[PDB]
Design a protein around this ligand. Structure first.
Ligand SMILES: [Mg+2]
Ligand SMILES: [Mg+2]
Ligand SMILES: [Mg+2]
Ligand SMILES: [Mg+2]
Ligand SMILES: [Mg+2]
Ligand SMILES: [Mg+2]
Ligand SMILES: [Mg+2]
Ligand SMILES: [Mg+2]
Ligand SMILES: [Mg+2]
Ligand SMILES: [Mg+2]
Ligand SMILES: [Mg+2]
Ligand SMILES: [Mg+2]
Ligand SMILES: [Mg+2]
Lengths: 226, 134, 260
RNA sequence: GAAACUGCGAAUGGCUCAUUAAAUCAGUUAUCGUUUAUUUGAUAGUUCCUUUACUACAUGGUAUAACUGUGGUAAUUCUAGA
RNA sequence: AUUCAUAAUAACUUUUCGAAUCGCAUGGCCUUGUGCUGGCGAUGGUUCAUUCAAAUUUCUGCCCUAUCAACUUUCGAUGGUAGGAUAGUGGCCUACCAUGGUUUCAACGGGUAACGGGGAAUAAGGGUUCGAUUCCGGAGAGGGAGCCUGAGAAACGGCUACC
């Protein structure tokens, strides 16, 4: 009976193969998202509070949050939901999903530690998994550092150094939404194009109205005279 | 000697591809459809351009022999000849190399093989390499 | 069914393209654009077939993607761009300007013209309507919307499009006696002058046109394009000038010119 | 430049003739009874809930794929937790 | 030919749109500030035209059969009014009301070893027979039905259910 426990503050995961089913009965008949005490699952899990996060069952059908059944049911699944990846835009499919009630038919649970215990684990707590990359947006790295509203994010980008046997380069992400003179040039061009079109339309309207006045006077001249 | 006397008709200047288009007909008595490379060399010297910028194709031998009529191209330079010419014709002249690519069925089967993988697939290959042994 | 079509099969193409019957199941389907599919000449047909500057479609795309071709002042890199009647086709190389006009047989003839007269074109007015904010506009036979036209400009008239900007230089009224050019029917390609036009209120105006050789014919107003008054056409006419020689005199002219 | 988000296309083509007897279809009409991606041409100074309660424009925010790691199923272009 | 285009007044809205996008060159100017103006493009976006269309639609035209003479109208059949629904007209659907509509000039029914046409074979002329099939139009993806996404599908090398 595997357990996929996780430590989101340090981002580590491990598998725990826990036998002797009355050590597992505390999990039984419990919903996803609600906590469960670590007193009964383990002897080293003293002070640990586990939050149920998900997991699979036998035959590999994932638990779905929201379905209050201890059994497995067929659900029609649209996009932006779990347990389904649409292969076509707007495609929907019917897939069997295990319920959110923890029961004997689960092959594995997935758990989130919300409160650290009075001991230390072999791989989870002691090792902190490094962040894969930092932020990319200018304001995202600004709020990552809290510099100021008007500063330069040129020289505060987190950098990664890549070795290739002999050479050693350093690479950084391309900052998005950065204020650049090219962006300022584009902005003032759109506003200049808007006003230039407006002036041209007004001159076209003024010229046409003068044409209408000249033709109105002409037709009024011959209608009165002849 | 044998009077190959290569002859060019319907000459058209095409700066749109920077080349000369014309119809090449060869009057070759007591000879059989002489060549394309020799035909290229003689066309290279009559137009004074290059041998690597001269393209020839067609040349159907008229019934009874003694005459073959085809199409020829003289390119303004070799630099722009490698641009507008088809790849297969450059391989015919040795100016390029026929890419020894995998057969059409194998490429199609490979494409349908990689459609079944969502992503790089390095984890799926890792996962099957772990479950099969352990 | 089920949506717009994208393939134009060969033998379903317009007959005036003169596409050969064999050597291909398909024909180039013109894209959406200024001219109707049946009434247009794609750039690939103009380049490969009528002008022979390309031997196949890949050479047409090679020419087009290097800004060599220009339709009515703009490059139009589209392979099947639907160039049509009165369009000015500009090739920067060879210093050749082409205006698409039909020969007397009723096919798009290769007409080479000069720079000054290729600077403009002509557009038959299809509708005069008030737009938003009460602005009048005219719409021509090539889909151009020209705002603020002259009030005297009406439907079936022809404006002289600037072609360097969306401006109207001059217009010609659809009136009797003025030289016209037919753009449809079995009389397509002829040139003549208006004898008169009859109404038939409720549909299908009919127009009687007389050419230079006193030959008269009747065609629908949909096919009539005004190009000027009696004499002095606003554009250069193609060779033949739309006189419709009969097959007997065409044979006689042919035998005289090739017999030397 | 892989991969994966995003866009577009997948409604074309190709095959067949089982339905179908004013039905399809042919020629000819009509939309002053409508929808229309794309193309082409034209086109937007007014952006304040109730201005005498506008809010950074030298430019707002989170939330995710790909990626990292932990897996379940005998098996699928299955996917779950971090 | 219009209550058309268009404009104006009074308001209304789970307020639509009104560039927080990308490339190349990166110039010119005077309060020399990394200040102000500036080109050629690409992609987006409202509306109107155009093009590709689509849907609906007017007249006339189809094989054999009466051992098929009446059919349709409960449960829309024909029409009116109002609404709903549709992209829109319309018994398309609903409510109420009227009793209509087709037919020996062959309605309705049955058969089709029937997809329609351009065409094909034969023939002095007129005819007769064929047209599943290179083009055009329609229908379908084992049989039905339903539906998501999209401008466009009742799509099936899309989905859902049943057989
Ligand atoms: Mg096309
Ligand atoms: Mg099809
Ligand atoms: Mg497109
Ligand atoms: Mg109604
Ligand atoms: Mg009614
Ligand atoms: Mg049948
Ligand atoms: Mg048939
Ligand atoms: Mg059959
Ligand atoms: Mg279908
Ligand atoms: Mg079958
Ligand atoms: Mg279907
Ligand atoms: Mg299939
Ligand atoms: Mg198919």
């Amino acid at each position: 009976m595997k357990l996929n426990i996780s430590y989101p503050v340090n981002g580590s995961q491990k598998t725990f193969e826990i036998d002797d089913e009355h050590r597992i009965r505390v999990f039984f008949d419990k919903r996803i998202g609600q906590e469960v005490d670590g007193e009964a699952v383990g002897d080293e899990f003293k002070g640990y509070v586990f939050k149920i996060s998900g997991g699979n069952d036998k035959q590999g059908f994932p638990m779905k949050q929201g379905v209050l059944l201890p059994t497995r049911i067929k659900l029609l699944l649209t996009k932006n939901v779990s347990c389904y990846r649409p292969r076509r835009d707007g495609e929907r499919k019917r897939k069997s999903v295990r319920g959110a009630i923890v029961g004997p038919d689960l092959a594995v649970l997935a758990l989130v530690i919300v409160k650290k215990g009075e001991q230390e684990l072999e791989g989870l707590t002691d090792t902190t998994v490094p962040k894969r990359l930092g932020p990319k947006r200018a304001n995202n790295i600004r709020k990552f550092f809290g510099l100021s509203k008007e500063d330069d994010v040129r020289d505060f980008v987190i950098r990664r150094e890549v070795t290739k046997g002999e050479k050693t380069y350093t690479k950084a992400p391309k900052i998005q939404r950065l204020v650049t003179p090219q962006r300022l040039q584009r902005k003032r061009h759109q506003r200049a194009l808007k006003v230039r079109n407006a002036q041209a339309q007004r001159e076209a309207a003024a010229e046409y109205a003068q044409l209408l006045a000249k033709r109105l006077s002409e037709r009024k001249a011959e209608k009165a005279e002849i | 000697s044998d009077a190959v006397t290569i002859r060019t008709r319907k000459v058209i200047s095409n700066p749109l591809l920077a080349r000369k288009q014309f119809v090449v007909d060869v009057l070759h008595p007591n000879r059989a459809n002489v060549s394309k490379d020799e035909l290229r060399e003689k066309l290279a010297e009559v137009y004074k351009a290059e041998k690597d910028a001269v393209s020839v194709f067609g040349f159907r031998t008229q019934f009874g022999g003694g005459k073959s009529v085809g199409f020829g191209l003289v390119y303004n330079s070799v630099a722009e000849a490698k641009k507008f010419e088809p790849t297969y014709r450059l391989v015919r002249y040795g100016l390029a190399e026929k890419v020894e690519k995998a057969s059409r069925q194998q490429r199609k089967q490979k494409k349908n093989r990689d459609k079944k993988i969502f992503g790089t697939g390095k984890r799926l290959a890792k996962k099957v390499a772990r479950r099969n042994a352990d | 069914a089920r949506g717009p079509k994208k393939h134009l099969k060969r033998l379903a193409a317009p007959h005036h393209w003169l596409l050969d019957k064999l050597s291909g199941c398909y024909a180039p389907r013109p894209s959406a654009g200024p001219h109707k599919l049946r009434e247009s000449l794609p750039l690939i047909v103009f380049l490969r077939n009528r002008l022979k500057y390309a031997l196949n479609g890949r050479e047409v795309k090679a020419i087009l993607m290097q800004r060599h071709v220009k339709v009515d002042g703009k490059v139009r890199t589209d392979t099947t761009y639907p160039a049509g009647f009165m369009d000015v086709i500009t090739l920067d190389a060879t210093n050749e300007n082409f205006r698409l006009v039909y020969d007397v047989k009723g096919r798009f003839a290769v007409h080479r013209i000069t720079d000054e007269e290729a600077s403009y074109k002509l557009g038959k007015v299809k509708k005069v309507q008030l737009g938003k904010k009460g602005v009048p506009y005219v719409v021509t036979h090539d889909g151009r919307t020209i705002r603020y036209p002259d009030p005297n400009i009406k439907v079936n008239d022809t404006v002289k499009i600037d072609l360097a900007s969306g401006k109207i230089t001059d217009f010609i009224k659809f009136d009797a006696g003025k030289l016209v050019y037919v753009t449809g029917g079995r009389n397509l390609g002829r040139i003549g002058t208006i004898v008169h036009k009859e109404r038939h209120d409720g549909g299908f105006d009919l127009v009687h046109i007389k050419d230079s050789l006193d030959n008269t014919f009747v065609t629908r107003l949909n096919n009539v394009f005004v190009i000027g008054e009696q004499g002095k056409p606003y554009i250069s006419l193609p060779k033949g000038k739309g006189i419709k020689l009969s097959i007997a005199e065409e044979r006689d002219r042919r035998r005289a010119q090739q017999g030397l």
